[PDB]
RNA sequence: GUCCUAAGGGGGGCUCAUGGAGAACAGAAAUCUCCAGUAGAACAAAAGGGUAAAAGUCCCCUUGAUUUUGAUUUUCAGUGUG
RNA sequence: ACGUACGACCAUACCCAGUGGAAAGCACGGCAUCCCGUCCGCUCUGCCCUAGUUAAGCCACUGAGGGCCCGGUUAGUAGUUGGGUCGGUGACGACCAGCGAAUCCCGGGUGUUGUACGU
């Protein structure tokens, strides 16, 4: 018998659109934005971390009734303006992107006419409060030393207060309940990629050339990774809003409207259909 | 209550001295207009945290028989109710129902003006975050009647709808949205529901200068049929339990 | 611009529910223009929001904590109806001196 | 559009199953055979329901299965086809490109006979795919496989004839 | 006459009853593979709208068998650290 | 206008099939030293964005079969209650009203939209 009958389609209940697309955990999202320890009616910020194949997306997101709003954004392709040209999806690029997002938030808020009610009711016995937010990375499974915690570590080092533990940073030991700072510092300046570069060059030279063809072509060495990464963090902390121009073709917004309208397929009318 | 989760749900549904925040049920009748459905979706947007929604049609007339309301209120633990229906005599009706002890306390019908209804999507402003309660401003001469009437009944119902969660303290940043209801005494007066976003400016003094901008839905209502509570159960409803 | 409004009848406030009641009449203009109608409604909403901010910032105590600038509100006084009426596998081993299951 | 190299058929997985039907030493010896053939630890499979006529019970280990992949899959499937002399049936092939066969002796596979273990039968089954199976298996943005990418029974028979030079009857 | 680190909790993985096509023993009913599979299985309740990447079913951790404080409720206290 | 990442409605969005996709972006993909987890690097995780490709995902369009969403129709009609008006032994006979259906029929459609970054 055919199970997909008129009765099955009549009582069929569709899920949410993003749940069918596999992009949103609506169970975790409801606990994110409708639950709070305190009831002071304060706004809440969530740091959204997403990872693609060639880019890292970090956003500062507020949740409203009609849709989410973005406060600030940092990208791994903006790290090209900061000197980071290869390895845009490793742990070091994620931590630099999280550091860049933290500096952009502080520069936008002025912590690096219209005025707030906090300044209106400010008491003389009051100090500057750090910017507080919670982490949201979505559906990505995370083991110890995940790259989404580098975005957490970069944002926390930049000046964003995120409540967190240290049990998932690279170098942590479950048995001793301790975190190895040397392994963490090795991950900070890209020593794990540098160790892979030296190990591959000693063992399999053909595999070393295939995986790191861009590093050899642009003359990026394993020993110079620590200097290159540390110089990028200084430049991020100095100029948080450096403009980046990519190598993609550049046109105006109206020109992209006309180009896509030429390549768009119009829907057939009632008379034609 | 052998199951621990079922026992916890029974204790949550049990009466308490300090009551839980009230839950509103949004249910649709057999015949309903799209304007009433959009108004129901707009009212659900301000109360996403403490509401449940029904997606099917119900053959219920609230002013004839309300046994199904008491069954839905008992099952879903909902004390507030918004009921939408359409008719030739009443084109767009929002039936607000408030319950007490899983029984119908009071109901009121709201006739929505179709030509002056604008939704939240039609206003391109910054919207309210989900979970934040707005402040309330009630203006007009129809809310201070010496006798209990429908406008005072609608004032208490709109207060309960936008009450949110009680709190002894509040942040200054959570005072950026206000809900304004205007209704004047008198042919039928028009109850106008306005929601505004609040911007603060320097005025040279300690107190800031308040500026408003339209945020929420532009709703115009006319009060219709009203069911007043029985005074014996009304007296039990206003009994104020002393907090320990 | 002044931060205080003047009306023939003073406002009434319920700071527990953030409620401001305006007993003064709202003279809605008898015109067919929606622009002048919403401008008058916004002006009344401006006056209601102004007296709400002034009452909250002057009659409620202010405490500056790490969470933020918090105002301690009085308990709510508006009467509202309630929703509900007011209210083993363990024995001892003698020869080993321990506890063990059946 | 069929010239695309990512429509090339390849082995998704190869599952070797032994169903002794009873727990104890016979299941342990069958697990040792599968561990010796593959080189990886086996899986103990329990019975879903209890039927008294067959000597099985719920939550009782009755079968052992090992999924063999990598280049180890082609060499074990070659061993299975060497036992079967590269001869299969049209009724053996499934409708979605997967196929398999059943043998009765791992001694014929190339394992020396041990009296402490014995001879156990096996159920061979090879699953096929094309590049693009990550879409239906990934956690984030999981979707379905399109009809033109699904493998038909005629395509896997033509692949079996072209690769292993076998005969299908 | 045997076997049981008890329940529960949190997290992660998977989809079930049945029907069709197949495969040495295996033949209506043993085991495996594919397809169709709104739940027609199971778990709870007694829906007139319970649960499907779960509330079902398998893995990891806890098993600590009833934690502490309170000038706050109700009751009790000739043994009032209550 | 198109793509991506968070979203609002939660089938006009679902089930099946076919055709096409300029740019970029997603995506398939290549390798298991380190982080990590499995019977199996399937999943997850780590590295690569170099090499191959729009085959599938995704988007757009089309096609049948259903399903779904609207408006009129039904119709102020069935049905349920009150009110008297005289008659009817009475029930009620009709009348006036208050609420207020559904089946059938017809016509239209098979997704809109918020923020941010790019093409």
Curated annotation (Swiss-Prot), chain A:
**Bilayer-crossing regions:** none
Concerning its family, UniProt says: Belongs to the universal ribosomal protein uL18 family.
Quaternary structure (record): Component of a hexameric 5S RNP precursor complex, composed of 5S RNA, RRS1, RPF2, RPL5, RPL11 and SYO1; this complex acts as a precursor for ribosome assembly.
**Protein name as annotated:** Large ribosomal subunit protein uL18
| Chief localisation class | cytoplasm
**Any Gene Ontology CC annotation:** cytosolic large ribosomal subunit
> Which PANTHER family does this chain map to?
LARGE RIBOSOMAL SUBUNIT PROTEIN UL18, RIBOSOMAL PROTEIN L5-RELATED
As one GO molecular function, the record gives: 5S rRNA binding
Its domain of life reads Eukaryota
Q: Where in the cell is it found?
A: Cytoplasm
What the protein does? Answer: Component of the ribosome, a large ribonucleoprotein complex responsible for the synthesis of proteins in the cell. The small ribosomal subunit (SSU) binds messenger RNAs (mRNAs) and translates the encoded message by selecting cognate aminoacyl-transfer RNA (tRNA) molecules. The large subunit (LSU) contains the ribosomal catalytic site termed the peptidyl transferase center (PTC), which catalyzes the formation of peptide bonds, thereby polymerizing the amino acids delivered by tRNAs into a polypeptide chain.
* GO biological process terms, semicolon-separated: ribosomal large subunit assembly; translation
Q: Which UniProt keywords apply?
A: Cytoplasm, Ribonucleoprotein, Ribosomal protein
| CDD domains xrefs | Ribosomal_L18_L5e
From Swiss-Prot, chain B:
Q: How does it assemble?
A: Component of a hexameric 5S RNP precursor complex, composed of 5S RNA, RRS1, RPF2, RPL5, RPL11 and SYO1; this complex acts as a precursor for ribosome assembly.
Q: Where is the Brix domain?
A: 22-232
Full protein name: Ribosome production factor 2 homolog
GO MF terms here are: rRNA binding
Q: Where are the transmembrane segments?
A: none
UniProt function note: Involved in ribosomal large subunit assembly.
Keywords (alphabetical) are: Nucleus
Question: What biological process terms from GO does the record include?
Answer: maturation of LSU-rRNA from tricistronic rRNA transcript (SSU-rRNA, 5.8S rRNA, LSU-rRNA); ribosomal large subunit assembly
List the range of the whole protein covered here: 7 to 278 of 350
GO CC annotations, alphabetized: nucleolus
Q: What is the lineage of its organism?
A: Eukaryota, Fungi, Dikarya, Ascomycota, Pezizomycotina
Q: Where in the cell is it found?
A: Nucleus, Nucleolus
Which organism does this sequence originate in? Chaetomium thermophilum (strain DSM 1495 / CBS 144.50 / IMI 039719) (Thermochaetoides thermophila)
Family of this protein: Belongs to the RPF2 family.
From Swiss-Prot, chain C:
Give the CC-aspect GO terms: nucleus
Annotated TM spans: none
Instruction: Identify the keywords attached in UniProt to this record, alphabetized.
Output: Nucleus, Ribosome biogenesis
Which Gene Ontology biological process is one annotated for this entry? ribosome biogenesis
Region annotated Disordered sits at 72-87
The question of whether Glycoprotein is a record keyword is answered with no
Role this protein plays:
Involved in ribosomal large subunit assembly.
As for family, the record states: Belongs to the RRS1 family.
Quaternary assembly = Component of a hexameric 5S RNP precursor complex, composed of 5S RNA, RRS1, RPF2, RPL5, RPL11 and SYO1; this complex acts as a precursor for ribosome assembly.
Record-given protein name? Ribosome biogenesis regulatory protein homolog
Lineage at the top is: Eukaryota, Fungi, Dikarya, Ascomycota, Pezizomycotina
Q: Which residues of the full protein are shown?
A: 11 to 137 of 202
From Swiss-Prot, chain D:
Signal sequence segment = none
Oxidoreductase as UniProt keyword: no
Instruction: Please indicate which superkingdom the organism of origin belongs to.
Output: Eukaryota
Residues crossing the lipid bilayer are none
* Nucleotidyltransferase is among the record's keywords: no
Biological process annotations from GO: translation
Q: Which UniProt keywords apply?
A: Ribonucleoprotein, Ribosomal protein
State the disulfide connectivity: none
Cellular compartments per GO CC: ribonucleoprotein complex; ribosome
Molecular function via GO? structural constituent of ribosome
InterPro entries according to UniProt: Ribosomal_uL5, Ribosomal_uL5_C, Ribosomal_uL5_CS, Ribosomal_uL5_dom_sf, Ribosomal_uL5_N
Relate the assembly described in the record.
Answer: Component of a hexameric 5S RNP precursor complex, composed of 5S RNA, RRS1, RPF2, RPL5, RPL11 and SYO1; this complex acts as a precursor for ribosome assembly.
By sequence similarity, the record places it as follows:
Belongs to the universal ribosomal protein uL5 family.
Q: What does this protein do?
A: Component of the ribosome, a large ribonucleoprotein complex responsible for the synthesis of proteins in the cell. The small ribosomal subunit (SSU) binds messenger RNAs (mRNAs) and translates the encoded message by selecting cognate aminoacyl-transfer RNA (tRNA) molecules. The large subunit (LSU) contains the ribosomal catalytic site termed the peptidyl transferase center (PTC), which catalyzes the formation of peptide bonds, thereby polymerizing the amino acids delivered by tRNAs into a polypeptide chain.
Official protein name in the record: Large ribosomal subunit protein uL5
For this protein's source organism, the top of the classification is: Eukaryota, Fungi, Dikarya, Ascomycota, Pezizomycotina
